[PDB]
Scaffold this active site. Structure first.
Site, PDB file in Angstrom:
ATOM      1  N   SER A   1     150.893  85.600  60.782  1.00 25.67           N
ATOM      2  CA  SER A   1     151.163  84.288  61.485  1.00 25.67           C
ATOM      3  C   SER A   1     150.483  83.124  60.785  1.00 25.67           C
ATOM      4  O   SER A   1     149.354  83.251  60.350  1.00 25.67           O
ATOM      5  CB  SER A   1     150.642  84.293  62.929  1.00 25.67           C
ATOM      6  N   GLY A   2     151.222  82.044  60.710  1.00 20.38           N
ATOM      7  CA  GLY A   2     150.691  80.825  60.052  1.00 20.38           C
ATOM      8  C   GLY A   2     150.989  80.775  58.562  1.00 20.38           C
ATOM      9  O   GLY A   2     150.910  79.724  57.960  1.00 20.38           O
TER      10      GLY A   2
ATOM     11  N   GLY B   1     148.984  89.269  61.985  1.00 25.49           N
ATOM     12  CA  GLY B   1     147.993  88.922  60.963  1.00 25.49           C
ATOM     13  C   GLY B   1     148.603  88.039  59.888  1.00 25.49           C
ATOM     14  O   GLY B   1     147.876  87.447  59.094  1.00 25.49           O
TER      15      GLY B   1
ATOM     16  N   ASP C   1     155.977  75.391  66.638  1.00 26.35           N
ATOM     17  CA  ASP C   1     154.777  76.187  66.274  1.00 26.35           C
ATOM     18  C   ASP C   1     154.295  75.840  64.860  1.00 26.35           C
ATOM     19  O   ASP C   1     154.529  76.561  63.892  1.00 26.35           O
ATOM     20  CB  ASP C   1     155.130  77.680  66.365  1.00 26.35           C
TER      21      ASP C   1
ATOM     22  N   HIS D   1     150.035  78.300  67.164  1.00 31.23           N
ATOM     23  CA  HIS D   1     149.458  79.424  67.965  1.00 31.23           C
ATOM     24  C   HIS D   1     148.224  80.049  67.271  1.00 31.23           C
ATOM     25  O   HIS D   1     147.586  80.903  67.845  1.00 31.23           O
ATOM     26  CB  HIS D   1     150.546  80.536  68.267  1.00 31.23           C
TER      27      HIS D   1
END
Ligand SMILES: NC(=[NH2+])c1ccc2[nH]c(-c3ccccc3O)nc2c1
Ligand SMILES: [Ca+2]
Length: 223
Positions: free
Chosen positions: A177-178, A175, A84, A40
């Protein structure tokens, strides 16, 4: 990260910041030329920033490298966030040392109860916003699948796990995410989603990396 602490400059050497004019997601360095993040977080024109502590000040240990290609997982579903995960190949290899280093992929999946380290430059407030310039860290345990499905009925798949505190107050946030979820020196999760941040009975949900090791290794080997 809400309710965490300041990591300290370069103490999370595999943490990267994905930048497209500004920081928009985290990622983890798995080898000198590849980064894993959340699907995402995909966009074109990504510059990967390694060796960062304060993302608004060049302090001396940074390596800024553009991505040559991005590969989103073949079964990624943006409506459910199932699968994801994405891989990013760097245009050139990074120079690895103690402040910029890769993290190992896991050989086994981690069990509920395992304590992990989550890090990122995401929002630090549950209500309102305040984005930090330096890297924040949070030590949190992986929750049982029963607690996780109970908190998010009909939304958790076998490719997700929950980690955090059911009491609230400590969680990853927008912020982050990932980014990485490291348990015993192995990359076990990728910050994926949550309902708000640090709310009671709404823990963070993470992509379960152990289920993608073959896909990651095969993809790296052929690209
Ligand atoms: N509560 C959490 N553990 C959490 C973690 C990462 C998130 N990332 C986001 C997010 C929100 C809008 C757009 C992109 C995002 O990654 N919300 C998030 C919530
Ligand atoms: Ca910097």
């Amino acid at each position: 990260i809400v309710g965490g602490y300041t990591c300290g400059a370069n103490t999370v050497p595999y943490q990267v910041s994905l930048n497209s004019g500004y920081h928009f997601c985290g990622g983890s360095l798995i080898n000198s030329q590849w980064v894993v993040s959340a699907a995402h977080c995909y966009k074109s024109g990504i510059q990967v920033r390694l060796g960062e502590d304060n993302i608004n000040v060049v302090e001396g240990n940074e390596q800024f490298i553009s991505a040559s290609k991005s590969i989103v997982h073949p079964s990624y579903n943006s409506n459910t966030l199932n699968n994801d995960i994405m891989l990013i190949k760097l245009k050139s290899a990074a120079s690895l040392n103690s402040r910029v280093a890769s993290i190992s992929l896991p050989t086994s999946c981690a069990s509920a109860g395992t304590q992990c380290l989550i890090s990122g430059w995401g929002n630090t407030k549950s209500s309102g916003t305040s984005y930090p310039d330096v890297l924040k860290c949070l030590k949190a345990p992986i929750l049982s699948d029963s607690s996780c499905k109970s908190a998010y009925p009909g939304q958790i798949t076998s490719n997700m796990f929950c980690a955090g505190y059911l009491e609230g107050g400590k969680d990853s946030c927008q912020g982050d995410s990932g980014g990485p979820v490291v348990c015993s020196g192995k990359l076990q999760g990728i910050v994926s989603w949550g309902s708000g941040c640090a709310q009671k009975n709404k823990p963070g949900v993470y992509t379960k990396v152990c289920n993608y090791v073959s896909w990651i290794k095969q993809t790296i080997a052929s690209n």
